[PDB]
């Protein structure tokens, strides 16, 4: 498909530019905005978003200086303990930390870079639950936090989370250290067991059915699963594509770039029946790309109340805060860039 391939290459170039140009002078990317108290300052994600955007740009061979500035920022802005989190204004967490590992997995060979990656991996494993065979996003806090961050023992913020476990397994596969293979395989076991009969997976942190599906399906493929999980996830994905060629969140949303990118990344795992669906989804992204080179964001990430242990059962009713949008479009756009790269390879 030469005409499509050229338009996807141009799309990716414009997106890479938009992401690179959004980098702050000190190397960080900022997105997400929220707070719990009206009479306070907004929390903005620095560490998580920096790692996530960095990883996506690393994957597509973006400006090595941009990438280095971001790695250096992350090294100098780790939490005192526990790795990285939304920002230094919040506790550290497994998912932010997994994204740091994922970003650093692209920089291998120099002993300093090996040390930084091994350290990040050690921090990720702090969140590993050996008894349950999954990752908990937050560790139950030692002392009650200052502004009532919901990481206390009993909070669902500290449960084993399927979305985080799926990503963390993929990330550990990218690192490729034998010592981590046991954790990686336990993550795959958990996702295999908890796939819906329909073929999707639910998420704790994500307002939809697209996110865990994408990560869990790839994890199982990387693990060589023979149980049909990947094919069922792809069939579900094919069956849920919208008439405009995009995908939405699967819980009532219209087509978004985020959901479409996740869907495409899922389809590329089993491309045999999927070629027209891949092409139409790529066309949807090409057609809807903003002039700026990014895509429109939508409400994608949900913060459940700590007393809610199954937010997927009540996505509208579980919310501590309104569903978060990445209003700077960097998280959405980084998700797209990864999918475009996947589709070009």
Alpha helix (H) ranges present in the chain? Answer: 2-22, 47-59, 64-76, 94-104, 111-125, 162-175, 181-194, 211-222, 229-240, 257-267, 275-288, 330-344
**Of 342, 311, 321, 315, the residue nearest 162 (C-alpha):** 311
**Of 47, 78, 193, the residue nearest 134 (C-alpha):** 193
Q: Is 280 helix (H, G, I), strand (E, B) or coil?
A: helix
Contacts of 214 (CB under 8 A, 6+ apart): 262, 263, 265, 266
Does residue 215 contact residue 135 with C-beta atoms inside 8 Å?
A: no
Number of neighbouring beta carbons within 10 Å of residue 314 = 11
Alpha-carbon span 145 to 91, nearest angstrom: 9
Number of neighbouring beta carbons within 10 Å of residue 88 = 15
Alpha-carbon span 289 to 337, nearest angstrom: 12
Alpha-carbon span 193 to 200, nearest angstrom: 12
CA angle 164, 269, 257 (to 5 degrees): 65
Does residue 86 contact residue 32 with C-beta atoms inside 8 Å?
A: yes
**Of 262, 231, 267, the residue nearest 248 (C-alpha):** 262
How many Cα atoms within 13 Å fall on the side-chain side of residue 129? Answer: 19
Alpha-carbon span 175 to 101, nearest angstrom: 8
Indicate left, alpha or beta for 109 from its phi (over 0: left) and psi (-120 to 50: alpha).
left
CATH number, domain with residue 271: 1.50.10.20
Distances (CA, A) of 280 to 9, 79, 277: 16, 43, 5
Alpha-carbon span 337 to 291, nearest angstrom: 16
In 3-state terms, the chain is what percent helix, strand and coil (to 5)?
50, 5, 40
Exposed, middle or buried: residue 134 (CB in 10 Å: 0-12, 13-18, 19+)?
A: buried
**Of 76, 51, 74, 65, the residue nearest 20 (C-alpha):** 65
Contacts of 155 (CB under 8 A, 6+ apart): 138, 140, 306, 307
Number of neighbouring beta carbons within 10 Å of residue 224 = 7
Does residue 127 contact residue 136 with C-beta atoms inside 8 Å?
A: yes
The H or E element spanning position 324 is strand 324-325
Q: Is 291 helix (H, G, I), strand (E, B) or coil?
A: coil
Rg (CA), the chain: 19
Instruction: Please indicate the experimental technique that yielded this structure.
Output: X-ray
Contacts of 173 (CB under 8 A, 6+ apart): 184, 219, 222, 223
- Residue ranges making up the domain that contains 60: 2-344
In the numeric block, the tokens 């059915």 are attached to: 209
How many Cα atoms within 13 Å fall on the side-chain side of residue 13? Answer: 6
Size of the chain in residues = 345
Distance of CA 248 to the CA centre of its chain: 16
The total number of structural domains that make up the chain: 1
Does residue 135 contact residue 128 with C-beta atoms inside 8 Å?
A: yes
State the angle between helix axes of 211-222 and 229-240 in degrees (0 to 180), rounded to the nearest 10: 150
**Of 335, 331, 340, 334, the residue nearest 32 (C-alpha):** 331
């Amino acid at each position: 498909a030469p005409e499509l391939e050229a338009t996807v290459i141009e799309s990716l170039a414009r997106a890479r530019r938009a992401l690179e140009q959004a980098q702050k002078a000190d190397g960080r990317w900022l997105d997400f905005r929220f707070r719990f108290v009206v009479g306070d300052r907004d929390v903005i994600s620095s560490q998580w978003v920096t790692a996530y955007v960095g990883q996506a740009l690393a994957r597509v061979g973006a400006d090595p200086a941009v990438l280095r500035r971001a790695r250096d920022w992350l090294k100098a802005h780790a939490h005192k303990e526990g790795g990285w989190g939304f920002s230094l204004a919040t506790p550290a967490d497994a998912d932010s930390t997994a994204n740091v590992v994922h970003f650093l997995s692209h920089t291998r060979g120099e002993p300093s870079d090996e040390a930084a990656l091994a350290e990040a991996c050690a921090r990720l494993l702090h969140y590993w639950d050996e008894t349950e065979g999954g990752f908990r996003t937050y560790r139950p806090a030692e002392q009650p936090s200052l502004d009532g961050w919901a990481s206390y023992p009993g909070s669902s913020w500290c449960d084993v989370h399927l979305c985080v476990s799926a990503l963390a397994g993929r990330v550990l596969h990218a690192v490729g250290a034998p010592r981590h293979r046991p954790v990686l395989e336990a993550c795959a076991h958990r996702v295999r067991q908890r796939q819906s009969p329909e073929g999707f997976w639910d998420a704790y942190w994500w307002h939809g059915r697209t996110y865990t599906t994408r990560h869990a399906a790839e994890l199982l493929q990387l693990e060589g699963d023979t149980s049909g999980a990947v094919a069922r996830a792809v069939r579900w994905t094919l069956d849920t594509q919208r008439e405009d060629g995009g995908w939405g969140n699967g819980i009532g949303g219209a087509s978004t770039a985020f959901d479409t990118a996740l869907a495409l990344a899922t389809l590329r795992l089993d491309p045999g029946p999927s070629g027209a669906a891949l092409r139409s989804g790529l066309q949807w992204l090409v057609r809807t790309q903003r002039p700026e080179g990014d895509w429109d964001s939508a409400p994608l990430m949900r913060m459940p109340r700590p007393g809610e242990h199954a937010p997927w059962e009540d996505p509208q009713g579980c919310l501590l805060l309104p569903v978060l949008t990445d209003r700077n479009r960097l998280f959405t756009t980084a998700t797209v860039v990864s999918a475009l790269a996947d589709c070009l390879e």
